Design a protein around this ligand. Structure first.
Ligand SMILES: [Zn+2]
Length: 147
């Protein structure tokens, strides 16, 4: 293949959207503080959220590293910042469920999901993919517990 918008144009939009809103790397000490490093690649994402009730009030992502990691976290935490715990647990319940079923999203909203899965498989990109993946699922947990 010469040109394919499979991942290139996808993360292109992911980082460009992140540039239209130039905010990244922050720390909110309140309720949940979960950071995830990739000491091989240099990525470091400190996910500091504030869930004040049964929702998500805010989230600060101190994400450093490469193009995908700091961007994906910012994108998924933006959706989380505007969600609840039920909706977050559901999003991750289906997020993991996709891997058992085949390929499907209840909302069809696979913008980051298809980007994160793209790098998920390359030996060098898998640890940056699992980085954002495991860090987000670890923040508020997933499904109804995960464990
Ligand atoms: Zn990295």
């Amino acid at each position: 293949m010469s040109f394919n918008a499979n991942l290139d144009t996808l993360y292109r939009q992911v980082i460009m959207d992140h540039y239209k809103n130039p905010r990244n790397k922050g720390v909110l000490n309140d309720s949940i503080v979960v950071d995830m490093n990739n000491p091989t690649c240099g990525d470091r994402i400190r996910l500091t959220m504030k869930l004040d009730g049964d929702i998500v009030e805010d989230a600060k992502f101190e994400g450093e590293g490469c193009s995908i990691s700091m961007a994906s976290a910012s994108m998924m935490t933006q959706a989380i910042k505007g969600k609840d715990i039920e909706t977050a647990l559901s999003m991750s319940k289906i997020f993991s469920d996709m891997m058992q079923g085949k390929e499907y999203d209840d909302s069809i909203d696979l913008g980051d999901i298809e980007a994160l899965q793209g790098v998920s498989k390359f030996p060098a990109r898998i640890k940056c993919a699992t980085l954002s993946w495991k860090a987000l699922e670890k923040g508020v947990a997933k499904e109804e517990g995960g464990n």
